[PDB]
Amino acid sequence: SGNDDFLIPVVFPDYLISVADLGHAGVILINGETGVTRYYEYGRYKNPKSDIPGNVRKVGVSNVTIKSGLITESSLLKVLKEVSLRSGQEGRISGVVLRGKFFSEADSWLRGKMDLNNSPDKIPYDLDSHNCMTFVIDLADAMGLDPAWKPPVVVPSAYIEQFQLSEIDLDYDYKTNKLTVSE
Ligand SMILES: [Ca+2]
Ligand SMILES: [Ca+2]
Known about the structure:
Layout: E1 5-12, E2 24-30, E3 37-43, E4 55-58, E5 66-67, E6 70-71, H1 73-87, E7 93-100, H2 103-114, H3 132-142, H4 156-164, E8 168-173, E9 178-182
The structure holds calcium ion (CA) (2 copies).
């Protein structure tokens, strides 16, 4: 098909962190030819083999259906509901939809970062500077997608709204199970 791949940074702006050191972030990755879908995120997840806080994790999700280059609304809704329940405290999603040829490179980068979970050289979690949002920004930067400028203090809820100023918006509500894509 030659259809561009999809990278969908997702932020859960109403996610509650509760204890110190707003929102959580993850990323959906979709093969534009096949609809094969991956989800990765970085956060304060348990790891018995590392004493350094912060780990990448992969969450299994359904694949989407691509029809004439587009993701069908229903198949994306199924993934968004999965991600909200499994990673997002059953809250709403604010996202952007990015396009390019990068599926294998993104998959390799994410698996490579996950391979660092037990490394003595793993960069420690930092709520301000090395967190769920900066993981995704660093991925998009690495793909050549030129994400929005990263401030010294990265707040997922604030950053995603900045990112949306220059990209396609994705809004999803878990309670109503409704998706809206907009400029
Ligand atoms: Ca918004
Ligand atoms: Ca926008």
